[PDB]
Amino acid sequence: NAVLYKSNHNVVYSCKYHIVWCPKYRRKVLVGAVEMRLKEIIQEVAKELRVEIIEMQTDKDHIHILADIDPSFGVMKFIKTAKGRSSRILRQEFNHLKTKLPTLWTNSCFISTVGGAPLNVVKQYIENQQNSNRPKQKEKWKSYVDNLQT
Amino acid sequence: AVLYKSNHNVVYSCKYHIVWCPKYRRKVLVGAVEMRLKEIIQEVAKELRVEIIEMQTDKDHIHILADIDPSFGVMKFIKTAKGRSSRILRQEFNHLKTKLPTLWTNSCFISTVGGAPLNVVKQYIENQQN
Numbered sequence: 001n002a003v004l005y006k007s008n009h010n011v012v013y014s015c016k017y018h019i020v021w022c023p024k025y026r027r028k029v030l031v032g033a034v035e036m037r038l039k040e041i042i043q044e045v046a047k048e049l050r051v052e053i054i055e056m057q058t059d060k061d062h063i064h065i066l067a068d069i070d071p072s073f074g075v076m077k078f079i080k081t082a083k084g085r086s087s088r089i090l091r092q093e094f095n096h097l098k099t100k101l102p103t104l105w106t107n108s109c110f111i112s113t114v115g116g117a118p119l120n121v122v123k124q125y126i127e128n129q130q131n132s133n134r135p136k137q138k139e140k141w142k143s144y145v146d147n148l149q150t
Numbered sequence: 151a152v153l154y155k156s157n158h159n160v161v162y163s164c165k166y167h168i169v170w171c172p173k174y175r176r177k178v179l180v181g182a183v184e185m186r187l188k189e190i191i192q193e194v195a196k197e198l199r200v201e202i203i204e205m206q207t208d209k210d211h212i213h214i215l216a217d218i219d220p221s222f223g224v225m226k227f228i229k230t231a232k233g234r235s236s237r238i239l240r241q242e243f244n245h246l247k248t249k250l251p252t253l254w255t256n257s258c259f260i261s262t263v264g265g266a267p268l269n270v271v272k273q274y275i276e277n278q279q280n
Binding site: 007008009010011012013014015016017018020022026061062064071072074075076106107108109110111112113114115117119121122125126129130131132134 | 154158159160161162163164165166167169171173174175176210211213220221223224225255256257258259260261262263264265266267270271274275278279280
């Protein structure tokens with residue numbers, strides 16, 4: 001044994017999604033403190049899953065999110081974590097929520113990918129690949145790419 | 151895809167552009183190798199409920215536009231697709247095994263595809279909405 005190993009995983013991506021779900025029964029409970037606190041929690045979760053929240057607006061009976069999601073974690077990981085934590089904390093902080101409702105959200109949510117990205121990007125990805133003789137233009141093209149804020 | 155699918159209780163439309171290439175970009179994606187890869191990918195697509203809109207190889211890369219169920223996920227589809235084809239293609243073709251080291255690299259390219267949801271949102275909401 002004693003073989004020490006290394007594993008590398010590199011991904012180049014643009015994964016934007018529109019996401020919306022509603023509270024149970026769709027009760028217009030997303031207001032005042034509740035509303036603010038919901039966005040605060042969700043931002044925290046996004047930060048933990050390298051998710052960039054491009055935009056988040058709440059009406060009163062639903063929330064709509066536009067965000068780029070690192071696929072290594074994935075959109076479901078994000079939705080279930082966002083829902084689960086906001087559902088847990090909110091019911092603990094707001095009594096009208098924990099007693100007047102069995103759950104905060106439903107098992108339902110809406111997801112749809114949007115694509116604010118060309119195709120000449122692909123060619124660039126390829127053209128910038130190695131081939132035994134790749135010294136330059138690689139860790140160059142990589143460092144050129146953007147990272148999730150944090 | 152182009153319409154919306156339902157699963158469990160989640161309503162979605164998740165399509166992506168996926169690209170990855172042979173190590174050193176060796177132009178080995180041809181002849182029986184090219185065709186076999188396509189069969190393998192399709193077989194992996196079935197298992198992970200992945201619909202392939204379009205797939206094409208141009209010798210040094212493979213591009214797939216695919217509609218993917220977020221339950222399984224795109225990364226899971228990609229790791230499995232590459233792991234599966236690497237072992238099978240290297241096992242069936244000696245020139246992919248004995249020249250050398252691995253078929254693919256440790257990298258891939260993923261890009262989402264889709265049009266702004268507008269009516270569908272208000273529509274989805276109204277489905278549970280009352």
